[PDB]
Amino acid sequence: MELIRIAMKKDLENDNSLMNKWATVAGLKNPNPLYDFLNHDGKTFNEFSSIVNIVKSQYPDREYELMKDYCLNLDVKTKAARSALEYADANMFFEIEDVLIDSMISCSNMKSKEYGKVYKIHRELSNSVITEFEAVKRLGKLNIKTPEMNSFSRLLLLYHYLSTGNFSPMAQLIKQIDLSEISENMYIRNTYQTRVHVLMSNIKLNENSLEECREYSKKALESTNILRFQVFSYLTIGNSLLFSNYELAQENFLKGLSISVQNENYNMIFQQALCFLNNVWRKENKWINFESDSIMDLQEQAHCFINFNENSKAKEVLDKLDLLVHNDNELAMHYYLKGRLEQNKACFYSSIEYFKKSNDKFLIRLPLLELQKMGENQKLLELLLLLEHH
Amino acid sequence: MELIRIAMKKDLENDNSLMNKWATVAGLKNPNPLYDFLNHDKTFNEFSSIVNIVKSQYPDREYELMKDYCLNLDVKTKAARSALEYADANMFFEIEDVLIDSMISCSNMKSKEYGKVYKIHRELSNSVITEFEAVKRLGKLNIKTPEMNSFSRLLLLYHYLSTGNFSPMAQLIKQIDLSEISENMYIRNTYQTRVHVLMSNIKLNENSLEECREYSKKALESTNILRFQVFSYLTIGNSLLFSNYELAQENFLKGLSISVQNENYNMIFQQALCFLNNVWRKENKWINFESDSIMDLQEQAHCFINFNENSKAKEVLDKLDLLVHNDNELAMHYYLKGRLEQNKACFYSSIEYFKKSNDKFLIRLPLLELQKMGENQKLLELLLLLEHH
Amino acid sequence: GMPRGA
Amino acid sequence: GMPRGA
C-alpha cells in the first residue's frame, strides 16, 4: 500500500468532501475512476496527470516523498511507468528516473524498453559518459518507432547543445519536432510541449529576439506546474532583460529564488544570474561565490574586480581561469574579461570570434560595446554584426 | 554544294595525298566518310571531324566556311545540334541565333530542346529576362537530355560569373556530370572545356591560385577554340596579379597575340593589362580615356590616385556614383574612395561587398590598405574568417 | 558567465 | 576593375 494510498484514505475520514474536488482536480468531472484508484490495489489512472495534480494539491510539501514511493512500486511495463519516467526526468528526480531506466531496459514490454533505452542515452550524454557521436549512433541503432521517443531523441540533443554553448544547430533541430504525432500519452505530450516552450525561449534569447524569448517563457509558465520548468522560465525571462531593465531582471531572478528555497541547485542558479546581472550593471555584488573554482563563478569574480579597478586581484583570477578548458561560449567571455583588464582590442576581437562560433547573438553585445567605447569605426561594428561564422 | 566542299574539291584535284591527311585530322579509323561527305549532299558522326579539317587546312576562312556549312544543315540532325554548340562556344552569335529559331520551330524534339534552352541562355546573357524567369522557363521545359541538363547549369554559371555573384557557383558546378553525355562527343568535349574554364574562375575567386592555374592549363590542352584559349590566358594572368608582374603581363600579352583580329577579346586583354599596371602602381599606357563603362572609369580613377592627381580622381569617382554597380563592382568603388579619402570606413564597405560577392581574391586590396593604416591583425583575421550569409 | 538552462 | 570571363 503506497504511502500516497495510506495517506489519502486516512485524510478522507476527517474531510469527506474531497471526492467532488479531487475529481475536478484530476481531469474527471465524474468521479468513477478515483474510487477504483483509491480502493483496488494496483489500478492506475489512464493519465498520469491525475495522480500528479492530486499530490501537488493535497500534499505539495511531500511531493517527492510520495511520488518516489508510488513510482518505484509500479509495473514498469505499464503506461503509468512510462509517464513516470518523463515525470522523474522533467523534475530532475534522478533517483526515480535511474531506477526506472534500468528496470525498463530489463523488462519484456517493448514500448517501455525503448523508453528506458533512449532516456539512458540522454542520461549518459548529459553526464558526459558518452559523446554526441556515440549518442547519435546509438539512437539510430535503436530503430525508434514511437513518436514519443522520436520527439525526445531530438530534445536530448537540444539539451546537449544548450549546455555546451553550441547554439548553431538548435533552431533547425527543434523545428523537426512535431508533438501532434503523440496521441496515446497526453501527459508526455503536454510535458514535452513545455520542454519545447523553454528550449524555444532559449533559442530566441540566443538570437537576440528578446520579445519572442519572453513570449515563449510565458507559454512555458502558463503550461506547467513543474518547478524545474518554472525555474528556467524565470531565469530566461530575467536573462532577456539583463541589458535593459535591471529592476525587472532582478524581480524575475528573485521570484526564482522564492520558489527554489527548498532546492540547492536551483537556488545556486539564481545567485549566479543575479551575480551576472550586477556585474553587467557594474554594481556592488554580494552574489559572488568566492568558494568556487567553476568557470562561471571565477569569471564573475574577475568581472567584479575589473569593474572596481582591482586589476591585480582580477589578473590573479584570470590566471586561474587560463588553466581551465572552456567551451566556445565560455572562451568568448574569457576574452571579453581579458580585453577589459588589458584594454586590448585584440581580445575583444577574439571574444566576437567565439561568440560567432557559438552563435550567441545576445552576449556578443558585451565586447561590441567596449569596442564602441574605444572608438572603433561604426561601419566596422556593423560589418562584425552582419558577418557570420561558417 | 557548300563552300567547304567546293574548296575541298578544288584542292583535291591538285593534291591527292590530302585524303589520308584529312582522314587522320578528322580522327577517322578509316577514310570512307570523307569520300562519302564529298559526294552526297551527309554528315560525319562527330562534328570535330569537319571542324578539325577546316582548322587544319583553311584556318583563315573558318568563320566564312563554317557560317556557310552550318546554315545549310538540316536542323533535325546531330550535326546541326553540334553546330549550335560550336556557334555559342565561339560567340558566333549570328550563326547561333539563326540555328536557335530554326530548331525552336522544327518538328524534332531533341533539336527543339536544344534550341529552347540555348534561347534562354541568349536571353539571360542579354538581360532580356531575369534569372528567376530563366529558372522558371527551364523548369517548365522538363529537360530530358544530359546535354541540356548540363547546359542548363552552365548558362546559370555564366550569369553568376558576369554579375559578380560568385557565392552559388561552387555548389552548382558540382552538379554537372559530363560522363552522362554519351551520344554527342563533340558536345561532351566542348562542355568539358567550358567546365575547366569555369572551374579556373571559381578557384581564382576562392583565392586558390595554383589550382586556378591548373584548370586553365587543362582547358588549353583540351581545346582548339579561340574563346576558351582567351579566357584561360586571362584567368592565368589574373591569378598572378598580386605576385608576378612579368608572368601576368606575359599571359595577358599572349592573349593579345591570339586576339588580334577580334576587338572584343583585344579590349579584354587591354583592360587586364590596365588593371595589372594599376595594382603595381606603374605608369599605365592601357587606360581607356574614351569610355564610360564602370570597368574603364574605375581604372582611370585608380591611376589618378596612384599618381597623386586627386582632383582628377574625384571627378571620375563622382561620375561612377551615378552608375548602377553590382556587388563586386561596388566593392572596387569603395576601395577607390578609401584610397582617395584615406578613410577606413570605405575599406570596410569594400570588404562587406567583396564578402557579399564572395570574392576572396580582390578583397586582398582593401585588406592591405587597412594593414597600412595600422588596423589590428586579429581584426583582419576575423574579417577573413567570417562569411556573408 | 551567464547561467542558461532548459 | 579586373575583367573576368569563361
PDB file of C-alpha atoms in Angstrom, chain B residues 12 15 22 40 45 55 69 75 86 88 97 111 122 124 133 164 178 206 212 242 279 300 323 342 344 359 369 371:
ATOM      1  CA  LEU B  12      41.613  17.569-104.106  1.00  0.00           C
ATOM      2  CA  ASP B  15      46.771  17.277-104.303  1.00  0.00           C
ATOM      3  CA  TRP B  22      42.209  14.931 -93.922  1.00  0.00           C
ATOM      4  CA  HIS B  40      26.446  13.104-101.457  1.00  0.00           C
ATOM      5  CA  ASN B  45      29.287  11.100 -86.937  1.00  0.00           C
ATOM      6  CA  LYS B  55      41.110  24.410 -88.858  1.00  0.00           C
ATOM      7  CA  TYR B  69      28.189  24.950 -93.784  1.00  0.00           C
ATOM      8  CA  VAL B  75      18.289  21.368 -88.049  1.00  0.00           C
ATOM      9  CA  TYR B  86      30.122  25.313 -81.902  1.00  0.00           C
ATOM     10  CA  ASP B  88      27.733  29.505 -78.989  1.00  0.00           C
ATOM     11  CA  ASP B  97      20.561  32.766 -83.187  1.00  0.00           C
ATOM     12  CA  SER B 111      16.647  19.846 -81.629  1.00  0.00           C
ATOM     13  CA  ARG B 122      20.959  34.018 -75.017  1.00  0.00           C
ATOM     14  CA  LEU B 124      19.601  35.850 -69.983  1.00  0.00           C
ATOM     15  CA  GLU B 133      12.496  33.969 -65.337  1.00  0.00           C
ATOM     16  CA  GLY B 164      29.647  39.367 -59.653  1.00  0.00           C
ATOM     17  CA  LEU B 178      29.596  15.130 -68.054  1.00  0.00           C
ATOM     18  CA  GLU B 206      38.353  31.340 -53.764  1.00  0.00           C
ATOM     19  CA  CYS B 212      43.166  28.105 -60.655  1.00  0.00           C
ATOM     20  CA  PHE B 242      49.445  40.251 -56.896  1.00  0.00           C
ATOM     21  CA  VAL B 279      47.744  47.236 -58.969  1.00  0.00           C
ATOM     22  CA  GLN B 300      41.175  55.976 -64.688  1.00  0.00           C
ATOM     23  CA  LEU B 323      26.012  54.330 -62.245  1.00  0.00           C
ATOM     24  CA  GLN B 342      42.153  57.611 -46.774  1.00  0.00           C
ATOM     25  CA  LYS B 344      38.839  53.202 -43.143  1.00  0.00           C
ATOM     26  CA  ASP B 359      35.278  37.487 -53.898  1.00  0.00           C
ATOM     27  CA  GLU B 369      45.250  49.202 -47.172  1.00  0.00           C
ATOM     28  CA  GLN B 371      47.094  46.906 -42.752  1.00  0.00           C
TER      29      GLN B 371
END
